[PDB]
Design a protein around this nucleic acid. Structure first.
Ligand SMILES: [K+]
Ligand SMILES: [K+]
Ligand SMILES: [K+]
Ligand SMILES: [K+]
Ligand SMILES: [Mg+2]
Ligand SMILES: [Mg+2]
Ligand SMILES: [Mg+2]
Ligand SMILES: [Mg+2]
Ligand SMILES: [Mg+2]
Ligand SMILES: [Mg+2]
Ligand SMILES: [Mg+2]
Ligand SMILES: [Mg+2]
Ligand SMILES: [Zn+2]
Lengths: 141, 210, 83, 23, 130, 98
RNA sequence: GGUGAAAUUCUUGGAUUUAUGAAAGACGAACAACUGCGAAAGCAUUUGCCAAGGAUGUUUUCAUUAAUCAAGAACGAAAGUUGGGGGCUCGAAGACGAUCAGAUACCGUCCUAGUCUCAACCAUAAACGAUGCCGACCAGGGAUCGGCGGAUGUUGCUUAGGACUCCGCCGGCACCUUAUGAGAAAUCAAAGUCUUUGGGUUCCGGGGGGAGUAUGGUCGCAAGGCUGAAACUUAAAGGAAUUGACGGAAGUGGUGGAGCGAUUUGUCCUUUGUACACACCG
């Protein structure tokens, strides 16, 4: 179940059973790694890096080829984001809704959705503080 | 009391085939009561089949405003058109989508017109579905196509050829052609034309079309 | 049909293809990668079938695929082969 | 007696008791 | 004058409480004859009755033949608005009266005023309780 | 005792439904609950049809019809015999008149 | 004009009716559905902008971050309150006209507050699916909406694609049949998987009244909301279903079968409602 709605969708990706690269994949491991480094260098987040490596390159899944995950690779080379990406996107949504409400006061629906968004932000921030991926005194306002 | 009323034959413009509208009446001329103000700006709701002598156009009504008095003959000009209530109530049926569009269009002679277009979704010959509905996005696409066509015709032309487009209803056929790629349509019509403002009365322009 | 008429361990392969990707014995994706062959230029340029990105030919030519809700639409006049 | 009218009657006695004891 | 048919416009207001037969020209700006159901019968219960409509339309036909009108256009309406939209009992009585009097009928159209929404109707949410 | 599964109306997956006003008594009834009939009659009674078709200037003239969608509350629909009380088994039949 | 019939009321100083035009304020018909969207309340004229959302698709990403929740918050129909604007229609209260044995009502007329909007409150509804939420399993079927995939052969169509057609998958509002189930039954495909009793969690009931009353507290300008007794009283109250009787509602065994059963079928006045069963003279 959706955390903040009654929707019960099950749409998702299904990783193949074979955890090894397909024979048609020939890109060397260092090649995909430095491609990831450039991708993060302009400012792409690991989800977008994976999307681009999937649809614009012959890389179906990074983990199959290299043996590591994109965020781990970026952390190894010191290009991981300070705020984790999901929290970054949730905070972006929250500030967008806050700007809209600063223009639109009567939008009670948007106020309810902002309450939900900030609840999600507090959940994810609590988890990241517990896992020490955020500063112990990191605060959202 | 009806002995001091003089009948003034009404003439439609030569745009229509028959110009034998009627013989509306007005009291005798008197102090500040000449017949001119009696017939001044009167509208005559008449059927199109009367003017066109074609019954198949009986669904359409034509409004004509009397703006001059040429002796005993009163000359009229186009003042909008509309459906009969029977036709409109016959077209609006359940289990089908209704598409409505209005637009404001200007002609070459400073005539501002609001044109109302009507359209209904059409069933296919092999349809098993008991309804024929268009999504709200498709309805918005068709309303866009209908309004762009209404603007394209009316703005380019003048009242005489604009009505010449109304009588065969070629605008409806072009809308049906242009929306067939979105959704098949049936009974596409320009249901109503309303003249919102008219230019300063020009007598020579009136005699041009009469 | 009646599951007493089948073996849950060896399901008929004909009816496994039509199951949701996650409701199979071992879940597998129904997407694939393809060697798209353009009109005249070589540019094999492997594409994801469900690509969310507008794939462009290397020589900055016209677009090759268009993102959609499901499978990406190859541009007019292009062939492909599964990989 | 209808429950709605019983409630209205009781709201009226309470108005009265309140306006008496408080004032 | 001498024409094929000197048409007129008959405004038939067929309410459930009365009936009006208003005959005008093609513009409606000139009233020629205005007969009423209760302007014939002396009982309020019968102003909407078919008998009053028949008498009213007979008087209208007489006056129209006097004025030279030989054909009529029919505009039949109910009360309209927020109120009822079904024509009263006198509508059919007036129409066949006019038809069975020698007067010709050009066109018949329903011109009941139909709101495209409307203001609130009288009677209360619970309606007329009888 | 619950008399009907649908509770005497047609409302699933939604909250408020705008009401209509009864054609007879001007009662406020929900649109999905009110009894709705589309009456297509003729402006001319079957009897006056011939007399009118005769007094017509235009030989080719199809007599115009009347189209009206009538809304009724339950009390007026039962009183006017638009709907009648049915046996328990027959109430579950939603088929239009055979 | 209005009604069953009238009357109150308007009207030769033109009522009602007809045509044209303008202004005002509401209201968004038909389309319109055992359809959609929304946490609920609720949401139906166009276009544009703003932010948000479900579902689907995904060989994108994180990696347990989750479920339900005292405390604490957000929203919350209508009516109602304070002030400004607006005030068409309708319309509590009020006045009058009827009806009436009476008629402070039902019916009719005129209408005040209100109905509309802004700011601030109020936090209540049969706010209902009278069914809290999350999760698993367990019948069949055909419709329908959203997305996706496949196969189609016709398009006033602009190869794709749209529109129809057919087959699937996921998700949604629902519907039909059936018991192998459950239930006091009505009925329910969940209200099933319960004496063969245990997936997680919140709220909440303990005969009927007194009583959502008193009092205290708290919130609110108020109206009131939330929390919430006792004394005392009582043998039933209540639910579902059956038969009969009634309606100012419409038009006799046997054996076998069904039902826990009263009963029923057979017997094709019937159906229907019932709080009546001394049976409506209730
Ligand atoms: K998804
Ligand atoms: K109903
Ligand atoms: K479905
Ligand atoms: K027996
Ligand atoms: Mg509700
Ligand atoms: Mg409550
Ligand atoms: Mg409740
Ligand atoms: Mg609930
Ligand atoms: Mg237990
Ligand atoms: Mg108790
Ligand atoms: Mg037996
Ligand atoms: Mg009952
Ligand atoms: Zn009614």
């Amino acid at each position: 179940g959706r955390m903040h709605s009654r929707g019960k969708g099950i749409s998702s990706s299904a990783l193949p059973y074979k955890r090894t690269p397909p024979s048609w994949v020939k890109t060397a491991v260092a090649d995909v790694d430095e491609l990831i480094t450039k991708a993060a260098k302009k400012g792409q987040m690991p989800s977008q890096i994976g999307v681009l490596l999937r649809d614009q390159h012959g890389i179906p899944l990074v983990k199959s080829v290299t043996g590591s995950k994109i965020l781990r690779i970026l952390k190894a080379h010191g290009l991981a984001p300070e705020i984790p990406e999901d929290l970054y996107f949730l905070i972006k949504k929250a500030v967008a809704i806050r700007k809209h409400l600063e223009r639109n006061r009567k939008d009670k629906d948007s106020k309810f959705r902002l309450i939900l968004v900030e609840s999600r932000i507090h959940r994810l921030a609590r988890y990241y503080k517990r896992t020490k991926k955020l500063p112990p005194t990191w605060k959202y306002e | 009391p009806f002995t001091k009323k003089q009948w003034y034959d009404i003439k439609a413009p030569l745009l229509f085939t028959s110009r034998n509208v009627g013989k509306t009446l007005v009291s005798r001329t008197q102090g500040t009561k000449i017949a001119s103000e009696g017939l001044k700006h009167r509208v005559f709701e008449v059927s199109l089949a009367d003017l066109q002598n074609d019954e198949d156009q009986a669904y359409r009504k034509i409004r004509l405003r009397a703006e001059d008095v040429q002796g005993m003959n009163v000359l009229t000009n186009f003042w909008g058109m509309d459906f009969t209530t029977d036709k409109l109530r016959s077209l609006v049926r359940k289990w089908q989508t209704l598409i409505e569009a209005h637009v404001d269009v200007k002609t070459t002679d400073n005539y501002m017109l609001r044109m109302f277009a009507i359209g209904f979704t059409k069933r296919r010959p092999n349809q098993v579905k008991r309804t024929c509905y268009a999504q709200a996005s498709q309805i918005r696409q068709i309303r866009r196509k209908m309004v762009e066509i209404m603007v394209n015709q009316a703005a380019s032309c003048d009242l005489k050829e604009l009505v010449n487009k109304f009588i065969p209803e070629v605008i409806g056929k072009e809308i049906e052609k242009a929306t067939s790629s979105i959704f098949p349509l049936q009974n596409v019509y320009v249901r109503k034309v309303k003249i919102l403002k008219a230019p300063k009365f020009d007598l020579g322009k009136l005699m041009e079309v009469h | 049909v009646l599951q007493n008429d089948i073996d849950l361990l060896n399901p008929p392969a004909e009816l496994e293809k039509l199951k949701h990707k996650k409701k199979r014995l071992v879940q597998s994706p129904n997407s694939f990668f393809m060697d798209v062959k353009c009109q005249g230029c070589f540019n094999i340029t492997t594409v994801f079938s469900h690509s969310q990105t507008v794939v462009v030919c290397p020589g900055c030519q016209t677009v090759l695929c268009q993102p959609t809700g499901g499978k990406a639409r190859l541009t007019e006049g292009c062939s492909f082969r599964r990989k | 007696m209808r429950a709605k009218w019983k409630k209205k009657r009781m709201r009226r006695l309470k108005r009265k008791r309140r306006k008496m004891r408080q004032r | 004058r001498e024409g094929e048919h000197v048409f007129g416009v008959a405004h038939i207001f067929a309410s459930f409480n009365d009936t009006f037969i208003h005959v005008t020209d093609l513009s409606g700006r000139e009233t020629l004859v205005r007969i009423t159901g209760g302007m014939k019968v002396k009982a309020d219960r019968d102003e909407s009755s078919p008998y009053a409509a028949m008498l009213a339309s007979q008087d209208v036909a007489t006056r129209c033949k006097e004025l030279g009108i030989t054909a009529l256009h029919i505009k039949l309406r109910a009360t309209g608005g927020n109120k009822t939209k079904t024509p009263g009992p006198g509508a059919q009585s007036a129409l066949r009266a006019l038809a069975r009097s020698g007067m010709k009928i050009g066109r018949i159209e329903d011109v009941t005023p139909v709101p495209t929404x409307s203001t609130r109707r009288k009677g209360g949410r619970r309606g007329r309780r009888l | 005792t619950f008399k009907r599964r649908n509770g005497g109306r047609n409302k699933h997956g939604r909250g408020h439904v705008k009401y209509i006003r009864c054609s007879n008594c001007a009662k406020c009834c929900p649109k999905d609950k009110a009894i709705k009939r589309f009456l297509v009659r003729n402006i001319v009674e079957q009897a006056a049809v011939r007399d009118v078709q005769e007094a017509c200037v235009h030989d080719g003239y199809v007599l115009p019809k009347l189209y009206a969608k009538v809304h009724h509350c339950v009390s007026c629909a039962i009183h006017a015999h638009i709907v009648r009380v049915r046996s328990r088994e027959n109430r579950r039949n939603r088929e239009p008149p055979q």
